[PDB]
Ligand binder design. Structure first.
Ligand code: HEC
Ligand code: HEC
Ligand code: HEC
Ligand code: HEC
Ligand code: HEC
Ligand code: HEC
Ligand code: HEC
Ligand code: HEC
Ligand code: HEC
Ligand code: HEC
Ligand SMILES: [Ca+2]
Length: 593
């Protein structure tokens, strides 16, 4: 809500409440009815005393009989149509300061005047002063970068607070506390359960010209803020750090470069930036033996490592994993592999050597299908460079895994279908920091080399296909805190928001109402039994006692796995179908990146 103006005589009298509205085309006249909403604040920057910007809350809260100068929408001052009003009193708990910044906000959750009826909630701020440009500010961080992991954010019965901000109530003045002051608080909350490493600052402290003030997560060291993560330290007592009663000396020692570096990982990344392992070519014979050619190089500068991996001292580990059957999600739950340093090559010279992976399972009718490869490794580094893995105080970093797609004769660029992307997962995990099994971190592939339908699922369990280590099952299941060993794991965003993980198949999202080649073997561990292709996936986010199984054709457990596969085509899709239908994607909340 672009607004106007500051009311200076002798009270708050907010004069406009529109029209950016809730949701629609916009630029349409609106009517402010009929609930909520208001709050005011005063910040001083660093005048008291020698530390940081502070907000201060003027009384705004619950009420019984409908009133102006607090939290509600009633016996206020004249409001209607567009240009509203208005506050009572001024300096309640604190006191107004000439030549200072201040804060205003407005939200709208509505049972409307029978004219439209909506929405959930919608807020926007207006920071004020007594008639001049803008002295100083505290624009630390916007909510959208928060939404990457949360999609939408709205605490307190979703009442607050779309956008910015909550710095209003979460002050020393309003909250009690402790510590529910914004920096103090949200650090402590994300201290554990955070996907990425806590030391990743820009994941929240994103870079943004719109926010002139910060440049701050490392400009302004303070007990309360830094101590939130660094808990084992009691400053005033000298526990774990030299005693400090205040934060008047923090900065003298903790310069910006220092605090910005200690949390940075530039050293790690520059070391890794000096090594790359790519599969230059590949092929396979009829019975199932792969021949790979590996080319080690320095990605920057781009020159070759003439010697083979087994002679490069800085390599801690480097493996390739492979499997066959891209069109049907592979033929084994366990991919074959080789540890390159642990094996002398067949042929090679000058930065490129051939090895061969054997023991792959090639079912008959699938001689012309595609396979899958995935590099995996660790290198020892120290002080931003690679070093002999036996050097003192060396650290073991993890190669960014990668995958090439296989073909009986030579590498192919097409490969197995793309259901998700490292991009989409990084919006919570990072690209590509999430490491499982030590060194595996590719999600656009690799994981499925083992996490495929070949992964058995418990028939005994009342649980429907949430025992299958199939990638789709595993992922959906654990990010729902339902998968075994993954209970009580709090998932930030909307579980139902498909957009986060999924992606486009040249058209709609990769949850196309009709799968392309999702071979379905969802029930094993008992083996004999199997389950419908589409019912397979929906039974985790629409779990048990149900459906009835509301089971129309194809829908079922075992039936010769033929009546299961797939069997024919079935209306189960046509009904919940892509083209504008009685379900498809309208049924799920999905947004754009
Ligand atoms: C991904 C790295 C996230 C970023 C970016 C933000 N949040 Fe988050 N949030 C995330 C996780 C994994 C969790 C829970 C972990 C756990 O073990 O509890 C949360 C939780 C919250 C909460 C709820 C706290 C509660 O007690 O329920 C809040 C209010 C919250 N986070 C706020 C918040 C804000 C304001 C963010 C932008 C600055 C933000 N989060 C970013 C994951 C991630
Ligand atoms: C004033 C209307 C507030 C707004 C705006 C926001 N919060 Fe709040 N919250 C408020 C109070 C008075 C309290 C507790 C008071 C006390 O003395 O303890 C809280 C509490 C929280 C908590 C945890 C404690 C709890 O009672 O649940 C969290 C995690 C929290 N608040 C988060 C939060 C976020 C992320 C906000 C911006 C979207 C936000 N609050 C705004 C009052 C107010
Ligand atoms: C999301 C969970 C964050 C993480 C991860 C980090 N920071 Fe943070 N920080 C975050 C918020 C929402 C706020 C307050 C926002 C507001 O408008 O008040 C802060 C605050 C700080 C501060 C205080 C700065 C000031 O000017 O007072 C500091 C010094 C700070 N944060 C440091 C910091 C560092 C070094 C981080 C990486 C280790 C870091 N934070 C992570 C959100 C999040
Ligand atoms: C959570 C978002 C944090 C906040 C807020 C602050 N720090 Fe931190 N710090 C955090 C992590 C995850 C780490 C590990 C570093 C690593 O290499 O893994 C650190 C580390 C430090 C250190 C190094 C101490 C050591 O034992 O080697 C220092 C000196 C440090 N951090 C300082 C510091 C300051 C001054 C902060 C406020 C501006 C601060 N940290 C906030 C996580 C978080
Ligand atoms: C010089 C006398 C300092 C003053 C004043 C402050 N800090 Fe300090 N700090 C100093 C040193 C030499 C170190 C060791 C760091 C290392 O890598 O060995 C530290 C450590 C910290 C840390 C690290 C936390 C951890 O768990 O390791 C933090 C978070 C930190 N310091 C913050 C901090 C604060 C809040 C201060 C004001 C109260 C402060 N420092 C003052 C040197 C000095
Ligand atoms: C934010 C909405 C997320 C998206 C996008 C993705 N994941 Fe996630 N995942 C998220 C959180 C907050 C956690 C915390 C778990 C914990 O115990 O802290 C996780 C966890 C995982 C794990 C577990 C790893 C382990 O426990 O060792 C895995 C393997 C994982 N996530 C994978 C994964 C994939 C493949 C994603 C893209 C499809 C993905 N995640 C996205 C939150 C979020
Ligand atoms: C074969 C070489 C595998 C590849 C490649 C990946 N995974 Fe894995 N994983 C594999 C098996 C056989 C199992 C179950 C039994 C076991 O040996 O551990 C798992 C288990 C998991 C789990 C949960 C178990 C745990 O470690 O706590 C997760 C969260 C998981 N797998 C995820 C995962 C990811 C993200 C992968 C790509 C980075 C990946 N796996 C590859 C075998 C294999
Ligand atoms: C991150 C936790 C995700 C969420 C949220 C949703 N999906 Fe997902 N899905 C995710 C992964 C990592 C996979 C693995 C598939 C693979 O081979 O890598 C899947 C799989 C599916 C599929 C299979 C489709 C196909 O293989 O062609 C479907 C149909 C599917 N998921 C549906 C779906 C829907 C409707 C979602 C929103 C409610 C949704 N998923 C969320 C990761 C994640
Ligand atoms: C996890 C990623 C899911 C997948 C896979 C599927 N859906 Fe789903 N959907 C999911 C959740 C967590 C919810 C919440 C429903 C609620 O009431 O809160 C939904 C919602 C639906 C519904 C609504 C049914 C009801 O609420 O009674 C339908 C009809 C629906 N989704 C359709 C649907 C279909 C046909 C799926 C297979 C193609 C499917 N969903 C998968 C999460 C997930
Ligand atoms: C047309 C007759 C359909 C067939 C065939 C299938 N589904 Fe369906 N389903 C359809 C509608 C119009 C609805 C209403 C949902 C709503 O929110 O209005 C549903 C409902 C479901 C649900 C919801 C169950 C719950 O929330 O508890 C589920 C889980 C579901 N449908 C799954 C499902 C499966 C697996 C199907 C193939 C066996 C299937 N449906 C077929 C329309 C139709
Ligand atoms: Ca900036």
């Amino acid at each position: 809500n672009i607004s106007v103006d500051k009311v200076a005589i002798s009270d708050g009298i907010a004069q406009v409440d529109y029209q950016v509205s809730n949701q629609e085309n916009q630029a349409v006249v609106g009517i402010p009815s009929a609930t909520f909403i208001a709050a005011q604040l005063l910040p001083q920057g660093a005048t008291g005393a020698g530390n940081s910007s502070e907000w201060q809350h003027f009384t705004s809260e619950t009420c019984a009989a409908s009133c102006p100068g607090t939290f509600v929408d009633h016996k206020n001052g004249h409001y209607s149509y567009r240009f509203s009003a208005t506050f009572n009193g001024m300096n309640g708990v604190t006191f107004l300061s000439d030549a200072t910044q201040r804060l205003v906000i407005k939200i709208g959750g509505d049972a409307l005047a029978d004219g439209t009826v909506l929405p959930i909630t919608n807020q926007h701020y207006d920071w004020q002063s007594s008639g001049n440009m803008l002295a100083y500010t505290r624009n630390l961080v916007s909510i959208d970068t928060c939404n990457s992991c949360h999609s939408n954010l709205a605490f307190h019965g979703g009442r607050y607070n779309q956008v910015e901000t909550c710095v209003t109530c979460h002050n020393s003045k309003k909250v009690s506390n402790a510590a529910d002051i914004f920096p103090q608080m949200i650090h402590s909350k994300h201290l554990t359960g955070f996907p990425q490493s806590i030391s990743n600052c820009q994941t929240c402290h994103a870079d943004n010209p719109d926010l002139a003030d910060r440049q701050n997560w490392y400009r302004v060291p303070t007990m309360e803020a830094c101590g939130a993560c660094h808990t084992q330290i009691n400053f005033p007592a000298g526990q774990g750090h030299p005693a400090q009663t205040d934060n008047s000396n923090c900065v003298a020692c903790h310069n910006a470069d220092w605090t910005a570096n200690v949390h940075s990982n530039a050293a790690q990344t520059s070391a890794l930036a000096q090594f790359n392992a790519s599969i230059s070519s590949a092929s396979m014979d009829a019975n199932g033996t792969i021949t790979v050619a590996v080319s080690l190089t320095n990605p920057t500068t781009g020159t070759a490592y003439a010697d083979s991996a087994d002679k490069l001292k800085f390599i801690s580990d480097l493996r390739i994993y492979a499997n066959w059957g891209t069109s049907f999600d592979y033929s084994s739950r366990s991919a074959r592999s080789i540890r390159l340093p642990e094996s002398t090559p067949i042929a090679g010279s000058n930065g490129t050597y051939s090895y061969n992976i054997s023991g792959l399972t090639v079912p008959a009718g699938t001689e012309s299908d595609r396979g899958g490869l995935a590099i995996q490794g660790r290198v020892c580094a120290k002080d931003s460079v690679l070093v002999d893995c036996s050097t003192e105080l060396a650290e073991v970093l993890v190669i960014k895994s990668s995958h090439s797609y296989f073909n009986m004769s030579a590498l192919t660029t097409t490969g197995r279908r793309e259901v998700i992307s490292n991009a989409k997962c990084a919006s919570c995990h990072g690209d590509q920091q999430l490491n499982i099994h030590g060194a595996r971190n590719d999600l656009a592939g690799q994981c499925q080399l083992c996490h495929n339908p070949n992964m058995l699922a418990d028939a005994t369990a009342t649980n429907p296909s949430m025992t299958s280590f199939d990638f789709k099952q595993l992922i959906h299941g654990l990010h729902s805190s339902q998968f075994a060993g993954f209970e009580d794991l709090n998932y930030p965003g909307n579980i139902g928001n498909c957009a986060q993980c999924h992606i486009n198949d040249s058209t709609g999202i990769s949850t196309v109402a009709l799968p392309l080649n999702a071979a379905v073997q969802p029930l094993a561990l008992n083996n004999g039994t199997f389950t419908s292709p589409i019912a397979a996936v929906c039974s985790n986010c629409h779990s048990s006692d149900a459906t009835q199984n509301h089971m129309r054709q194809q829908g079922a457990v075992f039936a010769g796995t033929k009546a299961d596969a797939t069997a024919g085509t079935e209306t189960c899709a046509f009904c919940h179908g892509q083209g504008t239908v009685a379900d498809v994607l309208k049924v799920h909340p999905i947004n754009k990146g």
